[PDB]
Symmetry: C4
């Protein structure tokens, strides 16, 4: 209705970063992932794999103590801030991060919001997902704040009922990105990426293989890692959404769309990303 353009293959190709010969892990920064709780542990593994696959230099995972041992055998490249998401409720971060994500696998509690308020005093891009998404406003700060709601979460944030939202997705996503002054990645078929300066794009990739638990956790991690290796955080968000969907499309070439498990998106991304270089 607003003729929102698609972020196309050519846009992805033009904006994906190089990984120069003369670079080291510091060049690509340290990200912080605040995710995973005792009854929702998996989201931390899913977002952690997503992030480390996506071009960062180092990853610190601030997860609940009992979730740590579940990540290590799969992702021994991550290090930990023990009970990090809980500790972030109590004080500003003393360490500097290139980008921060909070929420996958976290409960929708006031303590999580206290951690959000603390993380937002850092000077870096911050992603809020899942349990960190609430009806609230956001402080003026330098770095972008990126919200990644599915339509149910968007209802929670805005009071716009899902059946109404789905009739005018880009109109609502844009209106709320403007009002909140946050980026909004409104998930679904033709995911909307709405920027608070009024730029808006639709994502052309993806399919129903993604319509299963965990896929958004992987996405959150992909955005996190891409924020570390892209100079322009807009490109990081857009490329992450695009490549996430493209991994599902590769899967369905030889596998049924009913059978994908989220973590496999991370396994597919290395070859998919290569195709866009």
């Amino acid at each position: 209705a607003m003729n929102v353009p698609f972020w196309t293959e050519e846009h992805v190709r033009a904006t994906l970063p190089e990984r120069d010969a003369e670079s080291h892990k510091g060049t690509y920064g340290t990200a912080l992932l605040l995710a995973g709780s005792d009854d929702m542990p998996g989201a931390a593994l899913l977002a952690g794999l997503g992030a480390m696959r996506s071009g960062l230099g180092k990853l610190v995972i601030g997860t609940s103590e009992n979730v740590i041992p579940l990540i290590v055998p799969v992702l021994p490249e991550a290090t930990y801030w023990r009970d990090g998401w809980k500790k972030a409720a109590d004080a500003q971060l003393e360490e500097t991060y290139r980008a921060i994500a909070i929420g996958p696998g976290l409960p929708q509690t006031e303590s999580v919001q206290q951690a959000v308020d603390h993380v937002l005093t850092a000077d870096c891009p911050v992603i809020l997902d899942a349990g960190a998404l609430a009806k609230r406003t956001y402080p003026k700060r330098e770095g972008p704040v990126i919200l990644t709601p599915h339509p149910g979460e968007f209802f929670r944030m805005t009071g716009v009922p899902v059946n109404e939202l789905q009739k005018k997705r880009a109109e609502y996503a844009k209106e709320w990105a403007a009002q909140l002054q946050t980026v909004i990645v409104l998930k679904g078929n033709q995911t909307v990426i709405a920027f608070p300066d009024g730029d808006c794009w639709l994502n052309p990739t993806g399919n129903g293989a993604l319509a299963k638990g965990g896929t958004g956790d992987t996405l959150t991690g992909m955005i996190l890692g891409m924020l570390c290796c892209h100079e322009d955080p807009k490109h990081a968000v857009l490329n992450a959404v695009y490549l996430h969907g493209a991994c599902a499309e590769l899967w369905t070439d030889e596998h049924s769309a009913h059978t994908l498990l989220a973590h496999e998106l991370s396994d597919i991304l290395p070859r998919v990303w290569k195709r866009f270089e």
Copy 2:
């Protein structure tokens, strides 16, 4: 003897569901898996992988507390109801599920039967396997009850000795599906799928690679997931049994039948299912 027809490739092709572009995890429902105990933990991983591979939207695994950490690194897409199978002994479920399975890796105790009685007050299809199979009767309810005995379990349920059962498998499975008013998936070479309205089919797929611990746990999960994405639960049961056997047949093309491990059925299913689309 009763000329029971085979559920054929063409039946599978005609009844497997689509996964539409305009769908999300809610479209494919949330299943509940009540499985896995401290000395039989593996069944929960096997049924959990089977279920998430088979087209559901979300999976909640109600397993013993100490089994949880053993599933997460392999299946980070599942969430948990801590000690769920034990808690189900005490009260009706307050959450709504698209389908429920109970029994793989559970002991054959009265407490498991109490959980069965509670789960049966939900309005959804329910699968009973392994430890949940007992000599008993079933309350009138809307959703189908699907029993998945091997011949030893069928003896436990009915008093029909295995050596007699094996002479007239479909006759006994049909008689007991009618008497109990449950679906009976009577396992073995030429698995019988007997419906309580008198429909009955034989499964043409599978081989001796399946004659090893855990394969039925994987099957239970496959039925669970297929109940979530098929409109007709009869088709879900039939397709699950068929595709389970077909995965073993793919394995034996290049691998010895002596060497299959149950979890690999789940790894094979993505490509096998694609062939039937």
Copy 3:
């Protein structure tokens, strides 16, 4: 020197079992693996994978309590006898097994020998490896006892120094198989399989990729599983040793011999075994 014959491809082909359409896990029996301790846990995973890959019907792993959780995510098809190897020191087994192995990852203690004495009152083939190998004698019983020493272990059992043993491997292995009335699988390049009735064979397969920790643990499991699916336990031992070596030979076609990890033998066996059918 004694012109001991090789167990050849044609011998393997002639003696490997079928896995009939009309069979179930009971047909292929339940094995018991008594293995793995707190500072040597890995041997239980290695022997467990080896066994379940090798044609048994069910596997019960009697391992230390804290080792259980380390096996489950890799081998969810196994079930457990909690602290089984320790409990076997106290009483005869009340359950019937098709075959038993004891020792991989167990300490060389008197308590392990007490478990050995108890396991030997069962009527089935029994394999002793690693910590279960000691200087001792064996009671008259129906089922074969199969010892799987490397030359260091053979010295421990016999007092024959390794440098002397290696000069006349088959002569010593035969002499001691006769004296003890046990099968002796004397490991190394050209493994000797000596039977207490005086039959003796050399194994023609294998290479230096096997000269690394854990490979014998995998072998012990392979023998265990093959004892369950072969009618003649001599063939089970011989085929296991042969196929174990053949998996290393397949590895070295495209991978360096320096780089094999024991568990990968188990991953290779499905395709290798197929070649001999």
Copy 4:
């Protein structure tokens, strides 16, 4: 500037060891890896996989008690010295090792230095990495001491600021290898391998896929294993650095350089090493 030569493919080919038919795990020695702590557990898995992939006979991992269970399911071929890195602070090793590595995933503490001092009284090559790297001197001993700093660690060791170091890498690495009488593997693009007898080489392999957490942990393990199977420890160091980089180059043929995870280097090495035989 000093015209330091590259260690080339032809050098690697000429110096990689054989793995003879008549060999066993003792031929290739037992290594000790002192690595992994509660908030940095992954380094032990990464270095452990690296080491066992690289031609040793046995590996003992002296890691913190709670890290053990995280390694076993991935690397069941390793055995353990429980809390080994901590115990090494208290006394000389009573066991003989072919080579020792200390530091990956260890904190930069005085207790780690006490363990270093004890390990150095053994008569074998010793690698110091990560937490074991400090500003210090080294006792006269037979076996080489091999330091594996990245430029940040080199600053910690020497006071040479990174921006100055990077202008004259080989000059500084050589000067400090001479002064300390240690081997220095100065990491980065064109890694410098400086020997204390004044030999020095540059590594021609590798790319930005390596510029991510954990890759140096894998390298430390590769050096450790190669020290066990090479007669000349200089060749072991040089070959390890070379093959490590070559694995990254193989990865980038079909996968994006942004997406490599360190543990995958270990998965690639078997085929890469084969190419140089």
